[PDB]
Amino acid sequence: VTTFVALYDYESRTETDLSFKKGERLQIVGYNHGDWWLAHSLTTGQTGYIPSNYVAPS
């Protein structure tokens, strides 16, 4: 699968967003030209919204 890598730690602050740690691998399951992407964490298996500027491509 194509993956992005987290640049920073992020603590979930909404009912729909996803917590993740720096360096973790995320599979983006919904791209959007905006501040939020829908991501699937390969570390935890959870799915939710993340800040698009918090990840970089592999």
Numbering used by the authors: 83 to 140
Paper text:
The Src homology 3 (SH3) domain is a ∼60-residue modular domain that consists of two antiparallel β-sheets orthogonally packed to form a single hydrophobic core. In previous work, the 3D-DS of the c-Src SH3 domain has been characterized and its dependence on experimental conditions has been described. This work explores the role of the hinge-loop composition by interchanging residues in the RT and n-Src loops between two SH3 domains: one being the c-Src SH3 domain, where 3D-DS has been described, and the other being the Abl SH3 domain, where 3D-DS has not been described to date.
At the same time, these conformations are different from those found in the WT c-Src and Abl SH3 domains. Although introducing residues of Abl into the c-Src SH3 domain is expected to increase the number of hydrogen bonds and reduce loop flexibility in all of the chains, residues in the n-Src loop of some chains show high B factors, and the loop has not been fully modelled in two of the eight chains (chain E and H) present in the asymmetric unit. Interestingly, although the conformation of the RT loop is mainly conserved, residues in this loop show the highest B factors in all of the chains. All chimeras exhibited reversible denaturation except for Src_Abl-nSrc, which was irreversible.
